[PDB]
Amino acid sequence: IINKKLDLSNVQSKCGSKDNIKHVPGGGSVQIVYKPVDLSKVTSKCGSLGNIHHKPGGGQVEVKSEKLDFKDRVQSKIGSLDNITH
Amino acid sequence: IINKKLDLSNVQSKCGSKDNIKHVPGGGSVQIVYKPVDLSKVTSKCGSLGNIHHKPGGGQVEVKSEKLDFKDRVQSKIGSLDNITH
Amino acid sequence: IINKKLDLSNVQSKCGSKDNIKHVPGGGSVQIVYKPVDLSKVTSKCGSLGNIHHKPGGGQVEVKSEKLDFKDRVQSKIGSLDNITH
């Protein structure tokens, strides 16, 4: 037996997975979970008088509330969330 | 037996999966989960007086509320969410 | 048996996973979890009078509240969240 390898790889495995995300407001509330999973391989080669511009966009999340009024009671009653049992 | 490999690969496996995402507001509420799974391989080669511009767009999420009024009670009563049992 | 390898790899495994994220406000509240999982390999080679600009965008999260009024009681009553039992 001869076993020979060159492992020049890039791996993401089970990344960013099985997140349990809950937002349970009375009111007037923001939850942002920003969770991209990105694998980038970039091999720019630039000779002579060339130019390479490598400027791929990122994620933008904008939430704007200009006016927001609650004129009576904001009320949450929670007995539980998300039960598990075995 | 001779086993020979060159592994020059890029892999994402089980990434960004099985997320449990819940939004249960009374009112006037934003949940953003920004979760792209992106694999990019880019091999720009630029000789002489060439130009390469590599500017693919990113994700944009915009939420705008200009005016929002609740003139009476905003009320959530939750006994549970999302039960599991074995 | 001959076993020979070159391991020149990049690995992320089980990273950023199984987060349990809860936001349970009465009102007027922001939760941001900024949790990208990023693997970047960059091999820029620049000869002669070339230029390489490598400027990929990052994540931007902006939350703006310009005006926000609660004119009566903001009230949360929680018996529990997220029970587990064995």
Author numbering:
A (entry chain B), B (entry chain C), C (entry chain A): 277 to 362
Provide passages from the article that reported this PDB entry:
The formation of amyloid filaments through templated seeding is believed to underlie the propagation of pathology in most human neurodegenerative diseases. A widely used model system to study this process is to seed amyloid filament formation in cultured cells using human brain extracts. Studying templated seeding in cultured cells, and determining the structures of the resulting filaments, can thus provide insights into the cellular aspects underlying neurodegenerative diseases.
Although the resulting filament structures differed from those of the brain seeds, some degrees of structural templating were observed.
